[PDB]
Structure 1
Amino acid sequence: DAEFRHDSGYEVHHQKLVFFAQNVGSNKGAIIGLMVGGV
């Protein structure tokens, strides 16, 4: 399996008035935001 074999693009411009934010370049796994119950 091959992915992004050459140049790519991604960006977010002029963000404001945020409460919860999560920025990740690469994530080889799991991402969790707001959790209440126990694991």
Structure 2
Amino acid sequence: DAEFRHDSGYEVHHQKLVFFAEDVGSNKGAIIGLMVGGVV
């Protein structure tokens, strides 16, 4: 009869991500393919 199936590769029910980036410093150079939330 009934079949309930829940198939999720990533499941997150409650999350709180905190990223703090601070860069006081001079003269830094980078090549970044993909950046989320960051400082060069």
The TM-score range, normalised by the shorter chain, is under 0.3
Gaps of 5+ in 1: none
Query: Does 1:33 find its partner at 2:21?
Result: no
**Equivalent pairs: percent with the same residue?**
95
Q: TM-score of the superposition, structure 2-length normalised? A: 0.18
Q: Normalising by the residue count of structure 1, what TM-score does the alignment of the two structures yield?
A: 0.18
Give runs of ≥4 in structure 1 deviating > 6 Å: 1-28
Take 1:11 and 1:22, find their aligned partners in 2: how far apart are those partners?
A: 30
Gaps of 5+ in 2: none
Give the count of matched residue pairs.
39
